Structure 1
């Protein structure tokens, strides 16, 4: 045989590069996934992640309450926290024994897979009673925030898109929904009559995941990295795996 790494007859090398290329390109086809993650960061350094993976389009929608830190099989001040919610829904509406609940997120990061079209991204960041803009009568039900998403990059390739926002003030009390559509550079409308029922099925088939990790380190080691998910950490460091035309 020829010698490895010296000619065009290195078939294991060419198959390696094609195997990686196919993965990148499959994800971007209309058969492939589009995924979104919402990361909510707590003052105790823990991170809630919510992930949804679906064909065609994907989204997540959470209430103010659902975004608050919840520690499984531990004490949570659950009564006092009911009271905190009443005080957040309406000023002086509750009887809590605290000024600031540490269960409230300090920051959100939204990340999309590189298969999204960034121009289709929509976000409904509501107040704590789930109203996008002060009052329903004047609310557009979303904002198109694609212009704010930063490319997460590895080796010069886009592995994901990130929008990061901090909630550092007492009045930063939110409900949150985000939505993105899978890339489609063709003129075949995946929602046209021919295929619209498959999109309806995709709503049922979307797989959800959610979990609270104790630290960003643990999130990176045991969630982001093992699954080849993209990420951007608090130090602005990029994670992901570049695959297009790469061994």
Structure 2
């Protein structure tokens, strides 16, 4: 046979490049996943991740309470934290024994897979009682924030999209939903002849949630093993470039 790495008959090399290219393009076909992650960062360095993976479109919706840190199998000041929530929902409405709950998120990062169409991203960032914009009567139910998403890049390929916002102020008390639609450059509407498949996709979407102890542990044990995209506090991008690559 020909010698490796010297000719156009390195079929092991051609198959490796096609296997990676096929994964990148399959993910972008309408048979592929679109995924979203919400990372809620806590002052003790831990991070809650919520991920949803589904075909056609995907989203996550959480209450203010559900985004608060919860330490499985440890104490969580559970009664005082009910009194915190009462004061968050209406000023001076509770009798908590703390000024700031350390279970409140300090920041949110939203990440989408590179199979999303960024112009379809929508976010409902509500106040603590789940109203998008002060009163329901004047609220548009979402904002289209795609322009704010940064490209997470590795070896020049877009491996995902990130929108990150800090919640550093005492009044940064939110509920949150976010949604994106899978790329569809064709003129076949996936909600036309395929409408009931999109309805089944709402049932088939897989969810994951877990609290990791540190961004390092998230990087090492959650992002990297699964070939997910990420952007850490130091603005370093993580992910795997696949199109036309070995």
Runs ≥4 in structure 1, deviation > 4 angstroms? Answer: none
Cα offset, 1:26, TM superposition:
0.1
Tell me, in whole angstroms, the C-alpha distance in 2 between the residues paired with 1:190 and 1:133.
Answer: 31
Tell me, in whole angstroms, the C-alpha distance in 2 between the residues paired with 1:236 and 1:125.
Answer: 24
Tell me, in whole angstroms, the C-alpha distance in 1 between the residues paired with 2:77 and 2:85.
Answer: 12
Counterpart secondary structure, 1:65:
coil
1:126-172: per-residue Cα shift (whole Å, max 9, x none)? 00000000000000000000000000000000000000000000000
When normalised by structure 2's length, the TM-score is 1.00
Counterpart secondary structure, 1:168:
coil
Cα offset, 1:71, TM superposition:
0.0
Q: Which runs of 5+ in 2 are unaligned?
A: none
Cα offset, 1:106, TM superposition:
0.1
Counterpart secondary structure, 1:153:
strand
Tell me, in whole angstroms, the C-alpha distance in 2 between the residues paired with 1:113 and 1:13.
Answer: 27
Tell me, in whole angstroms, the C-alpha distance in 2 between the residues paired with 1:225 and 1:170.
Answer: 33
Tell me, in whole angstroms, the C-alpha distance in 1 between the residues paired with 2:193 and 2:216.
Answer: 46
Tell me, in whole angstroms, the C-alpha distance in 1 between the residues paired with 2:219 and 2:239.
Answer: 10
Tell me, in whole angstroms, the C-alpha distance in 1 between the residues paired with 2:153 and 2:90.
Answer: 42
Q: Which runs of 5+ in 1 are unaligned?
A: none
Cα offset, 1:30, TM superposition:
0.2
Tell me, in whole angstroms, the C-alpha distance in 2 between the residues paired with 1:67 and 1:5.
Answer: 51
Cα offset, 1:54, TM superposition:
0.1
Tell me, in whole angstroms, the C-alpha distance in 1 between the residues paired with 2:120 and 2:114.
Answer: 13
Counterpart secondary structure, 1:235:
coil
Q: Does 1:235 align with 2:231?
A: no
Cα offset, 1:207, TM superposition:
0.2
When normalised by structure 1's length, the TM-score is 0.99
Counterpart in the other structure of 2:64: 64
Counterpart secondary structure, 2:65:
helix
Tell me, in whole angstroms, the C-alpha distance in 1 between the residues paired with 2:24 and 2:88.
Answer: 44
RMSD of aligned residue pairs (Cα, Å): 0.3
1:159-195: per-residue Cα shift (whole Å, max 9, x none)? 000000000000000000000000000000001x310
Cα offset, 1:218, TM superposition:
0.2
Cα offset, 1:116, TM superposition:
0.1
Cα offset, 1:24, TM superposition:
0.2
**Pairs aligned (count):** 246
